[PDB]
Amino acid sequence: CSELIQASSRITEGVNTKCRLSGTALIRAGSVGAEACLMLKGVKEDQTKFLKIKTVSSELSCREGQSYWTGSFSPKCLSSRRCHLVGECHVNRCLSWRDNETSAEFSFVGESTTMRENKCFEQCGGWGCGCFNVNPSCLFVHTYLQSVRKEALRVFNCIDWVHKLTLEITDFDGSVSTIDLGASSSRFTNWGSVSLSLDAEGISGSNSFSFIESPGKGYAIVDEPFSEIPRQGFLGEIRCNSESSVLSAHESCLRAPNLISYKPMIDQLECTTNLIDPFVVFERGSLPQTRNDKTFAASKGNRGVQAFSKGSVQADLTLMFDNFEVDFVGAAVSCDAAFLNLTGCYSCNAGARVCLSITSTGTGSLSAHNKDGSLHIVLPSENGTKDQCQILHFTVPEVEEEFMYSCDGDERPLLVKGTLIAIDPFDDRREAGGESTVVNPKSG
């Protein structure tokens, strides 16, 4: 499918004399679920090492910007009522009480890291009230917030979405390699590095929603703009910088003014507040939600969020210094293959599925090539009988071809039959295409 003649090396009998193949390869990445093929040709009926690049999936990952944490809080109040001219019950001190200054009555609290505030309220003054003096008495209140539930939620926003391709690197003699990379980025794998161009679109715009993450539980979406300043009656009215601060109600957390409602009725004070339960909002908007045809959802491995939108990209990944050769592969191996069936479509991004029954005596590959060399089929061969499958592209309603299949041995013919279904576009001018298309919603 693609040779390395300008950098090919002698890959002596039996032993390997690989010379660290340095020539880069420029081949177009296959569509989603397709594969990219390489040819390492040595001596006929020998060598024929195949490096494959499976395209697992293309996702529109999120690039998070600012973030904060929040939880559920409830207040507790301590009250102390003193008559006039007792302690700091002077009226001038009474109205000018700073919220961050603690009264002397609540000194057993002492120094604490919890979020807290202090208020002073004037009351009646007189023998009916309880104090001989007729000037107004004072009620000092110290309130501190405490976390109700032992959980926290992280609220963030996506400034932009980035295309992100996952590849499966079927390496020479072993396919234990899976990598993920973005646009114009390279990853230092074995035998050099793999780079991705993805020159079509490196971004897919922005958004004006907010996202919630519950660690170990998933994600969710809320339909409000991400505000960096706390607001009463909204989400993130009390916000912190870490889960520990939320779970401990640490004083470093920010909160909006006037959240606590005070009821200084003469019998007992009532300290209470109405707070948006972030857990309720989190449960309301679990991720599988569609907004103006975007359908945000959890990325595989629950490491983020996606964005399914109509579109497509062009990916041209490049290898470099690809060198992975051994000596034990000098021995030849024989196999037997049997055509199984054909399904799929033609001239479609999904492509056509070919499944083959391979009856082999050992480890090996398959190198069926058509008469004109346009179409290539590669499938591993294993001991006994196995059923493998592959993805190709066609442009004919009916498929009837012959391929020259030979697994490092004698050349044999393989004949493929079957037809392909027709995709209805409901609107066609010239053709569909075969590029790399990202997932789209139905309403798009």
Ligand X SMILES: *[C@@H]1O[C@H](CO)[C@@H](O)[C@H](O)[C@H]1NC(C)=O
Q: Which residues bind ligand X (CB under 6 A)?
A: 85-87, 98, 100-101
- Residue 261 has a CB neighbour count (10 Å cut-off) of 11
Measured from the CB atom, the residue of 129 and 320 that comes closer to another protein is: 320
The neighbouring-strand residues paired with 52 are 37, 170
Instruction: Please provide the size of the chain in residues.
Output: 444
The residue number whose beta carbon is nearest to ligand X equals 100
CB of 39 to another protein, least distance (A): 13
Which residues fall within 8 angstroms of residue 375, CB to CB, at 6 or more apart? 369, 392, 401, 403
CB of 90 to ligand X, least distance (A): 9
- Residue 106 to residue 112: CA distance in whole angstroms: 12
Instruction: State phi, psi for 163 to the nearest 5 degrees.
Output: -65, 145
CB of 152 to another protein, least distance (A): 24
CB of 293 to another protein, least distance (A): 9
DSSP state of 299: P
Site for another protein, rule CB under 8 A: 6-7, 22-26, 286-290, 295, 297-298, 308
- Residue 414 has a CB neighbour count (10 Å cut-off) of 18
Instruction: State phi, psi for 181 to the nearest 5 degrees.
Output: -155, 160
Following DSSP, what letter does each residue of 15-74 receive, concatenated?
S---------EE-PPP-TT-EEE--B--STTS--B--EEEEEEEEEEEEEEEEEEE--EE
- Residue 202 to residue 205: CA distance in whole angstroms: 10
- Token pair of 35, please? 């594969």
Measured from the CB atom, the residue of 212 and 305 that comes closer to another protein is: 305
67 contacts which partner out of ligand X, another protein, none, CB within 5 to 8 A by kind? none
- Residue 107 to residue 378: CA distance in whole angstroms: 79
CB of 154 to ligand X, least distance (A): 29
288 contacts which partner out of ligand X, another protein, none, CB within 5 to 8 A by kind? another protein
Measured from the CB atom, the residue of 102 and 437 that comes closer to ligand X is: 102
- Token pair of 240, please? 């912190």
Instruction: State phi, psi for 5 to the nearest 5 degrees.
Output: -65, -35
CB of 89 to ligand X, least distance (A): 8
Measured from the CB atom, the residue of 86 and 389 that comes closer to ligand X is: 86
Measured from the CB atom, the residue of 96 and 395 that comes closer to ligand X is: 96
The neighbouring-strand residues paired with 188 are none
100 contacts which partner out of another protein, ligand X, none, CB within 5 to 8 A by kind? ligand X
Measured from the CB atom, the residue of 26 and 85 that comes closer to ligand X is: 85
411 contacts which partner out of another protein, ligand X, none, CB within 5 to 8 A by kind? none
CB of 5 to another protein, least distance (A): 9
CB of 305 to another protein, least distance (A): 13
432 contacts which partner out of ligand X, another protein, none, CB within 5 to 8 A by kind? none
Sheet of strand 376-377, all strands in order from the earlier edge strand to the far edge: 376-377, 368-370, 401-405, 412-416
- Token pair of 155, please? 């609220």
Measured from the CB atom, the residue of 25 and 169 that comes closer to another protein is: 25
85 contacts which partner out of ligand X, another protein, none, CB within 5 to 8 A by kind? ligand X
86 contacts which partner out of ligand X, another protein, none, CB within 5 to 8 A by kind? ligand X
- Token pair of 106, please? 């609540």
CA-CA-CA-CA dihedral for 236, 240, 242, 246, to nearest 10: -80
87 contacts which partner out of another protein, ligand X, none, CB within 5 to 8 A by kind? ligand X
CB of 237 to another protein, least distance (A): 36
286 contacts which partner out of another protein, ligand X, none, CB within 5 to 8 A by kind? another protein
Measured from the CB atom, the residue of 133 and 273 that comes closer to ligand X is: 133
Q: 424 by DSSP, 3-state: which?
A: coil
Measured from the CB atom, the residue of 12 and 100 that comes closer to ligand X is: 100
